[PDB]
């Protein structure tokens, strides 16, 4: 479009004979996401919901990606094993880590999903030390309306990182920031949604109420839905993971949607109120295998590609058969080196774009019980 | 600092023998601005308050900066004269516009203030037409805690622009985004503060309550002050400016601080509640000349360099003498071409960094009445 | 308003409250006035004559929503 070819008809609020007041009022009334955020960006974006995922980012690990190679970890492995609480499966193997990363990328390419690659500087550090956990790009997943700077609850190695990923998203994809979390703790990228307007959070080391309130208020205004629901789990865990029980600070280790009104769910996830809400709203529950969960094989850390199809850890054999039994296709992918820190496959994927998908009304209307 | 020289003592929440819970809790309790925003940026920033201004940005105009040269303006001058409502002083003169821009930059250099320069692309456009009003970089002023994407109430030519300036601030100064305004209208950069924790807004074409609530909640959490006050003027004006009265949609045309508890104020600004609040809180009022105000010479659009010293339009002779009479130094600067659109000198300056300055308690404690 | 609403002979009673910028009775710089009857008045059913210095944004919004047509007084008058 030529610079001198623009006319007033190109302004959507403009009408011939409109008064100043009416034009201004029409402007005040416009939807941010569809009038400002997306047109300025020149594209749609956001991972909200359980519709068809189209675009992600991965990080190919280098030696600097390995948490056990930070000088602060070397100084006290037990401090970080306290924070993270995951079972010790030995040192991370760089080459095997790189191979399961390739395998995941191939799974995406084979399912028609665009993969961007995010790199970090050599010797990457923040004001408090080497970066740590920066392979877990879900922490930079993009919401309807824009990107989010997180407040990390337990991992100081992630200070600076949600900034880095959001800056990357702006510079590379033209995706704007929506909000910075500035109180308490809130790690929205580790949350999952179980319908178009239903978010799952936890109260945990990774989320307090103030942080949660701040996030939910921002994303609800750009969600593109009339309602917005937050289901808040209350896991019993001190740091990230409770190796006695399988309980986890992060929703995406606790629960995820596998189809319309079908969820895979940890046995350590659901307090009575959460169970009640899920029952009342007509969600069918597939229970993850208890040993897979407790041993931190991340059987709930599956990635929904679209209703009825997920990527899962290839060695979560029992949970995956239950998922297939519920009529869902499982794409098995190796994810073993990734689990030596605080996440699995879904945790390491930055979700950039997911198409609008089934709603809470759709869940409620499904006849199955 | 070497990558392998980092230790746990470099994490401010870390203490020898700290439990996981206690470390996490300490992390939740940290101040965002001072633990995360500023260290990651590698600097302090924000224009809040009435202390000493140190750093700004200007735009040197090109032909594309001139509002009267947009094809949409050519199509209907009267549509845009409706929105803006400023007196018609003839076509903008590019060369004279460039000269008063140089003069302002020299005033900054002579007063020890760093000036960054912001450029826009050739034929700059947003989804709705040529950019318009993009010389007014105050609209991209930086708050304590970060940058803000605005919701413009009356000028569609500024869609995309607060994004551009915030992106520029991130890429060039490493200053992060704080929040995007996503409802109603809110043009925070056109607001002024009259103490360290006292903001002035309007309800007008440029601000509704929802937009205002969203902004104030975000900036109050990073303000670095125990309290935060919003004085909200209620000007009688349909678009930006009311040429019958001198009333304006923007606070920075209505009022500004010239010293500790001394304000220059338009006669068309103060409703009874605003007047009462200012009286109760011990603010001394210097009234702008009524003709300077009504004719849109922008006598209130002065820029506070520090308490007791302002930059003002050189032809606001009557207001400026009243400011000197109140014991304030006036640095007179030509600002005539700038006033052919919706602002004057303070409006065109992006404020990046102002040092903490006097507080509302300081205002209240000054003995003068 | 509480007293007159009880005897108004109407089911509802509405108060539109203008917020003029004026220190005493009249602001000779602007035309703003402490008194509604210098600011605005009805001239017909849903037609008002209105000062340019009268209407803050909320007042303007209310009048718009309630379908009042506005005739603007001459600014110099
Ligand atoms: Cl109207
Ligand atoms: Cl404890
Ligand atoms: Na917010
Ligand atoms: Na009475």
Swiss-Prot record, chain C:
Annotated transmembrane regions: none
Molecular-function GO terms, alphabetical: arginine deiminase activity; hydrolase activity, acting on acid anhydrides, in phosphorus-containing anhydrides; hydrolase activity, acting on carbon-nitrogen (but not peptide) bonds
BP GO annotations: arginine deiminase pathway; nitroimidazole catabolic process; response to antibiotic
Keyword annotations: Antibiotic resistance, Hydrolase
The keyword Hydrolase belongs to this UniProt entry's keyword annotation: yes
Keyword Lipid metabolism on entry: no
Protein family per UniProt: Belongs to the arginine deiminase family.
Role noted for this protein: Involved in the biodegradation of 2-Nitroimidazole (2NI) which is a natural antibiotic and an analog of the synthetic nitroimidazoles used for treatment of tuberculosis, Chagas disease (also called American Trypanosomiasis) and cancer. Catalyzes the hydrolytic denitration of 2NI to produce imidazol-2-one and nitrite. It is also active against the 2NI synthetic derivative benznidazole. NnhA confers drug resistance to 2NI.
Record-given protein name: 2-nitroimidazole nitrohydrolase
Naturally occurring in which organism (per UniProt): Mycobacterium sp. (strain JS330)
Classification of source organism: Bacteria, Bacillati, Actinomycetota, Actinomycetes, Mycobacteriales
Gene that this sequence comes from: nnhA
């Amino acid at each position: 479009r030529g610079y001198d070819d623009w006319r007033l008809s190109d302004i959507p609020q403009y009408k011939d004979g409109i008064s100043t007041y009416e034009f201004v009022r029409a402007t005040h009334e416009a939807d941010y996401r569809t009038h400002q955020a997306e047109p300025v960006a020149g594209r749609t974006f956001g991972f909200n919901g359980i519709g068809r995922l189209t675009e992600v980012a991965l990080h190919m690990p280098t030696r600097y990606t390995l948490h056990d190679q930070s000088s602060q970890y070397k100084e006290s492995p037990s401090f970080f094993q306290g924070l993270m609480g995951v079972p010790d499966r030995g040192p991370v193997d760089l080459a095997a880590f790189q191979r399961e990363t390739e395998e995941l990328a191939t799974a995406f390419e084979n399912n028609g999903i665009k993969v961007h690659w995010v790199d970090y500087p050599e010797e990457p550090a923040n004001p408090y030390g080497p970066l740590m956990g920066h392979v877990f790009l879900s922490w930079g997943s993009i919401w309807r309306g824009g990107s989010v700077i997180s407040r990390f609850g337990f991992l100081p190695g992630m200070v600076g990182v949600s900034e880095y990923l959001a800056k990357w998203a702006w510079n590379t994809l033209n995706i704007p920031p929506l909000v910075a979390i500035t109180e308490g703790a809130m790690e929205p990228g580790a949350c999952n949604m179980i319908a178009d307007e239903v978010l799952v959070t936890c109260l945990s080391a990774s989320y307090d109420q103030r942080g949660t309130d701040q996030l939910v208020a921002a994303i609800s205004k750009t969600s593109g839905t009339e309602e917005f629901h937050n289901l808040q789990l209350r896991p019993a865990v001190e740091g990230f993971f409770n190796k006695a029980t399988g309980a986890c600070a992060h929703p995406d280790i606790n629960i995820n949607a596998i189809d319309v009104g079908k969820l895979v769910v940890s046995p350590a996830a659901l307090d009575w109120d959460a169970r009640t809400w899920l029952y009342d709203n007509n969600f069918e529950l597939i229970e993850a295998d208890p040993d897979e969960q407790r041993e931190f094989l991340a059987p709930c850390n599956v990635l929904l590609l679209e209703p009825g199809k997920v990527i899962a850890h290839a060695d979560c054999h029992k949970t995956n058969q239950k998922i297939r039994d519920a009529g869902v296709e499982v794409i098995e992918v190796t994810g073993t080196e990734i689990r030596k820190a605080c996440g699995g496959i879904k945790a390491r994927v930055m979700q950039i774009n997911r198409e609008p998908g089934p709603t809470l009304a759709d869940v409620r209307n499904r006849v199955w019980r």
